[model samples]
Target chain A: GAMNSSNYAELFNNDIKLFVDDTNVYRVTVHKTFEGNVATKAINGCIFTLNPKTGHLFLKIIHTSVWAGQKRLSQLAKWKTAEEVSALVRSLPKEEQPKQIIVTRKAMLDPLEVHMLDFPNIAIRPTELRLPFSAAMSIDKLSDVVMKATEPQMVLFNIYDDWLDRISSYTAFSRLTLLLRALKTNEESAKMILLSDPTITIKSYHLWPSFTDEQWITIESQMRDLILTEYGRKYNV
Target chain B: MNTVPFTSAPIEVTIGIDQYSFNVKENQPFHGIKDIPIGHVHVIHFQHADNSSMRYGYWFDCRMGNFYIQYDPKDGLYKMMEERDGAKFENIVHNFKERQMMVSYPKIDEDDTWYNLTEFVQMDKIRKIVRKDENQFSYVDSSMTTVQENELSDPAHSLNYTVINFKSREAIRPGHEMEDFLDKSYYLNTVMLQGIFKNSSNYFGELQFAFLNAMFFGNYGSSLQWHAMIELICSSATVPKHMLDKLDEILYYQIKTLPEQYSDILLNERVWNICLYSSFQKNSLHNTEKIMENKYPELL
Candidate 1:
């Protein structure tokens, strides 16, 4: 019951964009998901990014635990309704009783299903909540890792596009979202997403693709201009 | 008539004492057996001899007792005899104590040499015949000596002969004594020497002079020149151009040897201190000269 096909699909299909501001503020944005009737579109969590160079460290707090706790309490509040189902069915007239039986049966089944579903939802909730945590950890880890990975290339780059300049503080979520948006809006930005994996592994999504020699210079110049003009204004240098 | 009679005459018998008949070992004294103990004090009674100079009579306290053990400085024999008997007729006593004591006289007419001596005495049983009088050799009143009066500032000069002269020069030959003296003096005064020649000398004097000289001078050619520079600077004179040139040469040599041999010395703080002191001294001397010249223009 826990390892359902739909569950795997939901998890694997879940996509997020990470954004970070020059001030080292971070945000994670999950893609808009459609529930049975409602569409949820919102940034999921707030995180902070640290560049030890400037002595800032990243941290992310989970929100799904609160959601899970609220859901559990709501089910407990409905527990009294379970005792009246039979009596409420018997009081109905003969013709309405069958419709009542269907309604009653559905209601009875809904609670069981809800209870069963809440268990896995609670179990998988951390993974959803932990996405921002993973992103912030990975950013800090990768910054240090990449710096050490190549000798004589101690420098790090935080590339920003023209639209990112408009955003006040870029979280990882917003950065990824902005990049995706740019990819959709600008043909030149679209060309920069050079590689895609059909398997859609986390590793495949994790990579920032290398640009061509011409594209690299252009992208670097564009990013530098955006970051410097927008972010440098705050430092007042 | 004599030839025929002489052949038979009973090997005719004049019986005489055979001096060589006994198989005796020749008894001789140890070398330097009769020199006075090096630092002992002596007292003697002075009597006027006919030449208007004092002749020593009885040694009031010879410290060496009555038995005279004489050594021939030339031949090195320990001859035990009485001083009054004269050498030829003196009893050749087998034991030293049986003989009379013979005093050392610096000159026959002088009252006594009266040197305070300290000598090493051998502890041989045959030589132990004479007993020394320790009381007679009472410790001299050293408080009255030039040493106590501070007239001789160097205590080394007043040290017993064994310490200052004998021990110091024991290993060295007579011919090389001057060189040895210079070397020892240099070692004793290294810090002062370094302070004198501070920078221009550029000579670190911790190790031996030859080694320091080698470091400073490219070759041995200008070592004496640098030494002269140090002397001049010590006397508060300006270091001359020739001396500076010599120092440059020495530095060139030092540079060549430094990476291998003298690196430790070059890096050492003590050596640097010496060089620094010398430099400061030279600068101070130069400044003082300028002041003197300014103050005494007419005299100059």
Candidate 2:
């Protein structure tokens, strides 16, 4: 209730002290312009009073713009929340605004399951999906699953150019198909391994061709154009 | 009955059935993290009123610990961390999995299908110690669930999945035993040596050394080192073409195995961007020299 040193701002080159008192009234009467000239004609020297009982800031405009009528004052002194005080005073000449925003209410990768295609009701158990599981109906069932499956999703395998040579034999085909998904690369522009496969069919896979030093120099530039084009398409660059 | 003096100030006193007397006092502000007052420290003194056989003076952090509340945007939760950079690795995986788990499978469903990990519990780190006649070496690889195996097979789609994230069997990294050797080895010339070369005729040895060299010499611009490290390791080995081909996957394991202690700094998108774009020098060693030179001009 006493003088709150934090809630005050100096205006008109420190000639006038502007602060909300215990009664919530800020005696702000601009006397001089920002350029140290007389501002008696610009404003009528009015006090900015806030009704604590009501939820709005009120200011009586004593002087209007040289041409406009009483509409400008209504525009200046509207129902402003306490948070908007700083923004409002910024419109005034040579006025310092308060720091610190007022916040009344301080507010606050796992794998997938592999399911069967046809008898959809019969889902493969997690344990059965691993190696050494039942091999009886599985082979025949998988063959049909591969046939019925429409087309393999195109998935990209992004790796360093260093590992490009070793991409083929890194993981077993069975394991590779098991882990393969229609996934995109984190680095969209990176050179990638494009593999098209549904889990059932390990055929129909495309690998990035190995390039000799002289051939790579040419191919690298060609790939760059494609990468850049793809990048632009993705982000509307 | 022992009587204690009290005033109207906000003071808390606790009495134990069998404990010695103690007093704590603090009248200063404890400011932290941008001059905000987190709490105050207190000095406690203990002694016998009859004058004196045992006396103890202990100091404790009044805030219990140096923790600050931050709003984690990923989960929209306010979490308490020891500092801005002390977030856990699991915290990162937890957030990333949530964001990327749901996706549309081509044949599965039009809408995104929700998939669950095979092993709901913690992923175990499994080690593989392969001893093939006279060529005995071990590399740590993490245990993968059936689903994780599928997820990693595509490689591109995995989210923050590294060998370190799972329970791995192993790496040729400086072992815990080598910590002492490194200290002693580096202490050679007034406690410094330019570099040490380990001579091994094995193909894997050459591959690992070449990989390390590539990481040291390669550029840091837009995953250039990433490419260099992988290629150098794979090409350096002269093992059976089949074994050599798998080197890329093993090299990836090393790349993704970012230490958990530094995940908060390394995984941070902003911080990682800084690391990525910090230097474009073709030689990483030169980049290091430039960065260190800029940071400490007096060294020059």
Write the residue-wise lDDT of candidate 1 on A1-237 in tens digits. 222234433322223211122111112344544554543222222223222112222222222232333333333322212212222223446443221111111223333222223122222111112122223323433334432332211123343222223443334334443343334334343433333323322232233543434654564455445445544566787
* Alpha-carbon lDDT, every model: 0.28, 0.25
The per-prediction i-RMS, to one decimal, reads: 53.6, 21.0
List, residue by residue over B218-299, the lDDT tens digit for candidate 1: 2231232233333333333333455444433333333333335434433333322333245424343343335433432332
Residue B161 accuracy (lDDT) in model 2: 19
Q: Give fnat of each prediction, in order.
A: 0.00, 0.00
Q: What is the TM-score of chain B alone in each candidate?
A: 0.18, 0.16
The global Cα lDDT (0 to 1) of model 1 is 0.28
Q: What 10-residue stretch in candidate 2 chain B is worst by lDDT?
A: B113-122
Name the regions of candidate 1 deviating beyond 4 angstroms: A1-46, A52-63, A69-207, A210-215, A221-237, B1-300
